[PDB]
Amino acid sequence: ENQYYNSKALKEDDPKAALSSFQKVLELEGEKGEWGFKALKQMIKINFKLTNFPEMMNRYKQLLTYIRSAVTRNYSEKSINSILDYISTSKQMDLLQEFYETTLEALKDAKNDRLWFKTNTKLGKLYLERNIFEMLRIDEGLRLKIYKDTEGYYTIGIGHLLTKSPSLNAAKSELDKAIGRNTNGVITKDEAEKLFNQDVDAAVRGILRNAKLKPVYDSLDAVRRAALINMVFQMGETGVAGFTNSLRMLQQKRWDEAAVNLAKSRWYNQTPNRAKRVITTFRTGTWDAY
Numbered sequence: 001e002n003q004y005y006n007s008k009a010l011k012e013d014d015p016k017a018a019l020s021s022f023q024k025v026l027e028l029e030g031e032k033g034e035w036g037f038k039a040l041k042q043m044i045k046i047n048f049k050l051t052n053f054p055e056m057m058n059r060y061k062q063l064l065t066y067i068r069s070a071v072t073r074n075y076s077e078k079s080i081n082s083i084l085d086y087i088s089t090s091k092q093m094d095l096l097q098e099f100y101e102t103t104l105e106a107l108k109d110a111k112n113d114r115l116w117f118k119t120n121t122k123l124g125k126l127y128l129e130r131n132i133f134e135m136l137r138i139d140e141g142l143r144l145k146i147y148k149d150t151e152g153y154y155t156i157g158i159g160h161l162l163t164k165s166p167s168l169n170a171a172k173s174e175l176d177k178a179i180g181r182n183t184n185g186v187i188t189k190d191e192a193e194k195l196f197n198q199d200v201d202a203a204v205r206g207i208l209r210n211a212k213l214k215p216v217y218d219s220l221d222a223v224r225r226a227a228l229i230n231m232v233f234q235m236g237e238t239g240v241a242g243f244t245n246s247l248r249m250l251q252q253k254r255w256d257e258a259a260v261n262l263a264k265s266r267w268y269n270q271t272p273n274r275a276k277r278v279i280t281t282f283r284t285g286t287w288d289a290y
């Protein structure tokens, strides 16, 4: 059958021509969903590789209309899960956000649907990453060009040490290796957030390896967890682990007592404004201080 034929012969190596022929497949017949569904999947993958995310989004909306009746729920959810899993490794924050929101809207009332919950969790974590990124941006600064920290070490983003070598080229090489392109010492906000998320995952693992921090960290909500991560960024794991009384009160959710006790530390006396914001976060469990 020629819908079959169009789809199959279409897969080729002039992506613009291949994509236009896929458009041909939706145009040619389309309505029976299986072949139009596969064509749209292909086009979404091809635009994701071609880095044209607007077109990818528009063709993803097309695909969703197929799942209500044109394609079996098992198969459609398989396809959407695949799309999720090969876009989970993208620095593209806004694309991920829009994708997640559209998926959530589309699957809201889908009978016996299990993907809405996975995407909703992913969007929650995305919002959380955005908030922690902004928090640390406010407390430590964001810099999109390579610079020297107070030790003279090449750094970028939010305190992301690139190297202790005095060679600027060595720093650029480490940066290119970590970002995956010839950046010439300059990066986007999104690339800065990728490095920062890596640094966050690191700090989280460290917190979990610390026998004094793991209890309090587990006990806390996501926002207060960010406050604790903030302290770890500022002082390191064992430095934070010295707040024995405050850590215990925190683990007990004695928010006001914990805040009062944290305000009497040397940390507060030394960096009052940052400590003030962090303690507000510990107390209220909100981002209001940021």
Ligand SMILES: O=P(O)(O)O[C@H]1[C@H](OP(=O)(O)O)[C@@H](OP(=O)(O)O)[C@H](OP(=O)(O)O)[C@@H](OP(=O)(O)O)[C@H]1OP(=O)(O)O
Binding pocket: 011, 038, 041, 045, 078, 079, 082, 083
């Ligand atoms: O099996 P192939 O002919 O080698 O091509 C496959 C196949 O697509 P087609 O059947 O349309 O050719 C899969 O799609 P389905 O059969 O499951 O519908 C698709 O899997 P996805 O569900 O993830 O789209 C897969 O992609 P991948 O191998 O990365 O999982 C894609 O491979 P190519 O697009 O590279 O040809």
